[PDB]
Amino acid sequence: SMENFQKVEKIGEGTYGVVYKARNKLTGEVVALKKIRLDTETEGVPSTAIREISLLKELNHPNIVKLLDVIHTENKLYLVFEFLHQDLKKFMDASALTGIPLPLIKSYLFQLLQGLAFCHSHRVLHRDLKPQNLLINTEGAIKLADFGLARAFGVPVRTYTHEVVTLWYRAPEILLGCKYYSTAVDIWSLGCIFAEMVTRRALFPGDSEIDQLFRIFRTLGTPDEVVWPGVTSMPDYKPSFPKWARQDFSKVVPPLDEDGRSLLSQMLHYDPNKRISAKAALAHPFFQDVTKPVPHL
């Protein structure tokens, strides 16, 4: 079964097993093997794996990792993917002294927006966008990966799982407990990542949900009914929240130009109905000169 693959090294680890770099012994193809442990007298195939595999089968796009095969045995389930040099978190960590060159930051965001807009157009919410879930290759591509929290959404949406998105990249409508969330939560995550690529550190590194909210409030201003109608009636909103004023983006993301500032603030708009969509983000003037530089690996 796994006869034909030779495990080469551990690339990461998760929830259901391990993630290995492996090679096909017959063709030489280098792959990433993601092991999902099953058993029996348990729950059968994990609902996160059933979604990951069926959502990935419908997401054929240059900016979305490619699922190559699914080896569904009686004991284990293996997801077989194309192998990319590394995740964006490792590339960021290796570039903390230099920083990521401006043109490559813009190229990475444009490609992240094109894979995200393809997801949304195929009625799929990602819901776990962070640097370690994004994959880069040696030629300048970047791809969405880790579809382990994703879900097919409906028009109009219903209520979905409340515990979604890694804390630092979580949208404020989730943190405030809104009954409904949708595609704007992935946009928020991408705004966070764009900033992080720019400044070289997490934009909102909270250490708990109230702390995460307060970091957002201190940078963008504590929202009120004028900036986000309905805010003060949200389930976890408290009228005793400190009221901080918005900080000028020249302090927030100093290296970013006017066009980049404009795009970042539309990705971080409080009100999800006004936050920019991935598709409109693709037409912002920040991308008029976009190119495809190769990373310095």
Binding site: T15, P46, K130, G148, L149, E163, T166
Partner: peptide, 7 residues
């Protein structure tokens, strides 16, 4: 850093 939220 935090782990991805878990079903």
């Amino acid at each position: 850093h935090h782990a991805s939220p878990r079903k």
